[PDB]
Structure formats: structure tokens, C-alpha cells
Amino acid sequence: GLQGMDVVHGTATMQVDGNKTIIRNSVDAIINWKQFNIDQNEMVQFLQENNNSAVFNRVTSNQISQLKGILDSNGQVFLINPNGITIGKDAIINTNGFTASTLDISNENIKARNFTFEQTKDKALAEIVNHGLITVGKDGSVNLIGGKVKNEGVISVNGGSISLLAGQKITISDIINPTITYSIAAPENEAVNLGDIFAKGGNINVRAATIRNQGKLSADSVSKDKSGNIVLSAKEGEAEIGGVISAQNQQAKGGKLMITGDKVTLKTGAVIDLSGKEGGETYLGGDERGEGKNGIQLAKKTSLEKGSTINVSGKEKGGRAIVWGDIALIDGNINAQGSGDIAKTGGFVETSGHDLFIKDNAIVDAKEWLLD
């Protein structure tokens, strides 16, 4: 399904052996394509000069990328396609870093390593959908950047970062372990997780106008030396949080979870699990007393629904849960228990707003529970 190869920076050769295509590219080569498809029984390999090498691929036609077979590389693979990118249910993308973007980035910015992506005005919003397996066995990251970003399959890395970024303009500090240094999303820019995302102690970042989680976001660790960090920002819209968000570490301290946006909802049945030997830490809807320190967004409305659970407990010592909403509705369970008696080893829970409603199903188990 690879058509119309045109190497516009660097050098790249193509070898076809049956259902397998091997592309040998120079470090940081840029290749344009009329079509970048990988059919079900096809395999594409980017054989790079070292494991830190990247290759940049751009579809310049109207052809949506249908990735149904195997895409692999010892280095990093970047795919740009403003028509959309769809990874099929039996597809495996196995690299040391995978970036798929429906937002455009110039050759000039690639060469400068200025990773600024912007929605083209000349095409409708497009989607990145993963139905298959996107996997990194080593240290690399996965970045999915688009008009809408949807995971229905599995994305799995080994201590690196996974970022689902939907917006009109997105700048990341790097393509490995990115910090989002600039982001603007329109209401139609949504990031949706129906499948499972695993970072094994690493980072998960999700940024869109609206975020919907029905599946699992996991940065669980089984190593004492590393705990995960999960950040969701639905700045222009709602963070609708169902499913499971986990960053446990039963060998040490649980990880950190921050969920902010204009509206933050933890739905009935949803579980946040940041437990460990010592409980982890979560900020939901803003910070202590709604001060807005460190530029954190204060939600206009934060609701923890009946039958939702925040677990920041520890076998030895409870963790920390900070909840803010200009209107704040607290109706779920918040467990910040430690070992024996709570007055000694329990954690710290703050739930506040300008209008605070501690509703009748609310249960908070902590050493200290603050209402301001």
C-alpha cells in the first residue's frame, strides 16, 4: 500500500521481498508519499542507523492511511496524514517511538526540531483511530496527534510516554517524552479512550477540548524505582471520566494523577487507583483552596458521582486527593487509608469550591478531610 515515494530530505532506499518492504533511511530523513497504507498481510520495516534515529513520513495526497498489517523499526517512525490514520484490529506498530499526526508540520520545523503541529484550514478535521496494537519495548514514546484521537485497541510502552493530543495547534518539546508546551483545541477536538493504554511506570498525557475515558489508562509500576504520572487536560470542554485510571506501585509510593478542564466528572462506576505501600496523589479540577497555583486550571464544575472511587490508600500510609470545582459536587468514595488507625497513618483529602455540595453518598476515609 506504499505508493509515490519521494525522499525530500536525506536518503532512503526501498527493498521489496514478497509481502515485506524494507526501507533503509538516513537519520531524520523526510519522505513524502502519495499513499501510505499497510495491507493486512503486509509488513513494512524502517531499518535505521541507530535506535534513536527518526524517519518522517508525509502523505501529500487525499488518501487516508489504512495501517492493517505490520509496521516496525529499530528507531522512531513519524507519520503525517491530514486525511486521517486508521490502525486496524490486527495491526501491530512496533517501534522505538511512534508519532501519528493528522495535523501538519513543515519540513522547516522538522529540520529545526521545532515540533509544532497545526490543523490545515484546507481540509476537514480528521481522526486517528487505533484498533490494533501500538507497542514500544524500549524507551521510546507514542504520540497520537489529530483533530480527533480515539483508542479502541491497545497502546503499550515501557516506562516512556504515551500522549493523545487533539487540537488546532499543538507544540511538544520533543517526540520522546514530550512536554506539551503549547495547545489550543476547538470544541470538536476530542480524545477518546475505549481501549487500554499502558505506560509501565511512565507517563500518560491526554489533551483535547473534551476527553472521554471508558477504558483503562494505566501507568502501574511493579518496580520500587519508578512510579507513573498521568495528566488529562480538557481545557475548553469536559473531562468525562469513566473506566479505570491506575498508577499503582505496591513496592513504593503510588503515582500521580491530574485531571483538569472546564468541567471534570468522575462517573458512577469509575475507579481511580493510585494505591501502593504509600498512596499516590491526585488533583482533580484544580488545586488547594482553588488558588490556581502553577497555572493550574480551575474547573467551573467538578462532580464525583455516586459509586465512583478514588483510591489513594497505602498499605503503610495513605496518599493525597485534592478536589476543586467552582461548583463542587462530592458523592463518591475517597479512600486515603493507611495501615492501622487512620488518625496516625491516613492521608489527606481536600474537597472545596465556591459552592461545595457534600452529597449523601459521599464517604471519605482520611486522617484529615478539609472542606475549604
Structure-block grid coordinates of residue 302: 467538578
79: left (phi over 0), alpha (psi -120 to 50) or beta: beta
* Distance, CA of 42 to CA of 148 (rounded, Å): 27
Non-local (6+) Cβ contacts of 307 within 8 A are 268, 269, 332, 361
* Distance, CA of 180 to CA of 143 (rounded, Å): 11
The answer to whether residues 109 and 66 touch, using CB atoms and an 8 Å cutoff, is no
* Distance, CA of 283 to CA of 239 (rounded, Å): 13
Residue written as grid cell 487536560? 233
Method: X-ray
- The torsion angles phi and psi of 280, rounded to 5 degrees, stand at -80, -155
The string of DSSP letters for 30-75 reads EEEESEE-B-TT-EEEEE-SSTT-EEEEEE-SS--EEE-SEEEESS
Q: To what resolution in angstroms was this structure determined?
A: 1.9
* Distance, CA of 246 to CA of 229 (rounded, Å): 10
Buried/exposed code over 159-185 (b: 16+ C-beta within 10 A; e: otherwise): bbbbbbbbbbebbbeebbbbebeebbb
Q: Which residues in the chain precede a discontinuity of more than 2.5 Å between C and N? A: none
* Distance, CA of 134 to CA of 92 (rounded, Å): 6
**∠ CA 372-350-329 to the nearest 5 degrees?**
80
The answer to whether residues 283 and 230 touch, using CB atoms and an 8 Å cutoff, is no
The answer to whether residues 116 and 80 touch, using CB atoms and an 8 Å cutoff, is no
SS3 state at 153: coil
Read off the CATH number of the domain in which 164 is found.
Answer: 2.160.20.10
Q: Which domain holds residue 131?
A: 1-372
- What's the domain count of the chain? 1
